[PDB]
């Protein structure tokens, strides 16, 4: 059995979309407020997260079917999944060696420690690293990693979503491609698909935990003033 | 004739306040999003203006009499005069030689050109330089420069001000010190005082012009997203 001309074209678009929105050299990071090791890392990570939102948005607009949803549903989907897509795409810079995100020399090597100088506790940063390690081990192909991001972004179960039947349909078609692709092109991945869907569940927990921490942060103006307009909007609840 | 123990203590506080909020080495500028020469200079100047707002606020809180006004009046005064105080304090880094603000090596040397890569036109940047040149020539003492900033910040004629009689009184006392100081300690400054008050008028024009340019900028989200929470609040009209 094999993939259809349809599923194949979906993959082409997603992989191209990703390449178009993710620089493996992280050259743009020099434009962020420099890191510093009262939350000395907040200005840098805020800029990093903000830069990522923009990237996740560019990627989403190229997810086939997404541009056709209502503006409102597009926003509802982006708002609730943004933090998860960031965690997923960051796997690409996560090194199991140093248990950190290597995005450059010393300055752009993000260690668990740094995120703490940004308003987050270690008891909560632990599941994140645990997630990154598990995800890294799945040794996903670019096609599976790019599909996993689209699947996550099209979850019908997000607050604020309207046409949850149409989002439901789009996601299923994507889940099919991932399932078919894994079977056809992935030697040894008979149980991979089920592992990937389990990552979606973990992201939910990580998402909920981030909301709580971010909430505290956003109620303190001395801190929220350090965020960027876009982060305040995506993570804000003015929805 | 001479200054009173009162006027003298006002001066001590203002000069100290200024020293406490203005670094002549501009060492903090390395924490701003780096300059770049669609408005490539906006992220840097936004951070510069934002950093300055915070400084102007710290200076204001030490202006004797100011901390006693209502929170609302303090905000009304800061909102409407912030841009003017920035223009005044920046005289300290303005070099008549290169007609620019020298705040560092090549990267932090602000030329008329750069401000254009930030949303502003040259036909409007012209009065600014003209103002900086005139102000520089007045060769003010630190006591006169610091007084001029306090006088400007306590102008009763600002939209949103409530107790314009109390702000009126505070400013007069400050205008008296400046007048007395110039007479007692400033050789050759018989007409200086009148020149300084004329600078206040010019700042009004510059302020009004900035509002118009900033307004256009703030209605375009692709651009306003580049500003900082504090700039959006101080220059915003949600007042």
């Amino acid at each position: 059995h094999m993939l259809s001309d349809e599923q194949m074209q979906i993959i082409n678009s997603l992989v191209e979309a990703h390449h178009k929105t993710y620089d493996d050299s992280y050259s743009d990071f020099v434009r962020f407020r420099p890191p510093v090791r009262r939350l000395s890392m907040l200005p840098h990570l805020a800029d990093l997260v903000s830069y990522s939102i923009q990237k996740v948005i560019g990627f989403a607009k190229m997810i086939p079917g997404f541009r056709d949803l209502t503006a409102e549903d597009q926003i509802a989907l982006l708002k609730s999944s943004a933090i998860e897509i960031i965690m997923l795409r960051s796997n690409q810079s996560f090194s199991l060696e140093d248990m950190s995100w290597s995005c450059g020399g010393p300055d752009f090597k993000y260690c668990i420690n740094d995120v703490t100088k940004a308003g987050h506790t270690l008891e909560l940063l632990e599941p994140l690293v645990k997630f990154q390690v598990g995800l890294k081990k799945l040794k996903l192909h670019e096609e599976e990693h790019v599909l996993l991001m689209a699947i996550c972004l099209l979850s019908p179960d997000r607050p604020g979503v309207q046409d949850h039947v149409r989002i439901e349909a789009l996601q299923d078609r994507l889940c099919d491609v991932l399932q078919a692709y894994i079977r056809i092109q992935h030697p040894g991945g008979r149980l991979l698909y089920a592992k990937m869907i389990q990552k979606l569940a973990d992201l939910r927990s990580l998402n909920e935990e981030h909301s709580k921490q971010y909430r505290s942060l956003s109620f303190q103006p001395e801190h929220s003033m350090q965020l960027t307009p876009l982060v305040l909007e995506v993570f804000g609840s003015e929805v | 004739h001479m200054l009173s123990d009162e006027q003298m203590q006002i001066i001590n506080s203002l000069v100290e306040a200024h020293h406490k909020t203005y670094d002549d080495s501009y060492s903090d500028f390395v924490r701003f999003r780096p300059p770049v020469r669609r408005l490539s200079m906006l992220p840097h100047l936004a951070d510069l203006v934002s950093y300055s707002i915070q400084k102007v606020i710290g200076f204001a809180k030490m202006i004797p009499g100011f901390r006693d006004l209502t929170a609302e009046d303090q905000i009304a005064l800061l909102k409407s005069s912030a841009i003017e105080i920035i223009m005044l304090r920046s005289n300290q880094s303005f070099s008549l030689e290169d007609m620019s603000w020298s705040c560092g090596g090549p990267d932090f040397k602000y030329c008329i050109n750069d401000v254009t890569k930030a949303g502003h036109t040259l036909e409007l940047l012209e009065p600014l330089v003209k103002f900086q040149v005139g102000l520089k020539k007045l060769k003010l003492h630190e006591e006169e420069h610091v007084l001029l900033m306090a006088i400007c910040l306590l102008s009763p004629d600002r939209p949103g001000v409530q107790d314009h009689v109390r702000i009126e009184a505070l400013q007069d006392r400050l205008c008296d010190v400046l007048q007395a100081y110039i007479r007692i300690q400033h050789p050759g400054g018989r007409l200086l005082y009148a020149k300084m008050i004329q600078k206040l008028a010019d700042l009004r024009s510059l302020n009004e012009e900035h509002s118009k340019q900033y307004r256009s900028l703030s209605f375009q989200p692709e651009h306003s997203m580049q500003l900082t929470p504090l700039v959006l609040e101080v220059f915003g009209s949600e007042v």
Binding site: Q54, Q74, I75, E233 | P221
Partner: peptide, 10 residues
Amino acid sequence: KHKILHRLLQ
């Protein structure tokens, strides 16, 4: 109002 998001979404 999500001004930024609407804008970035074209």
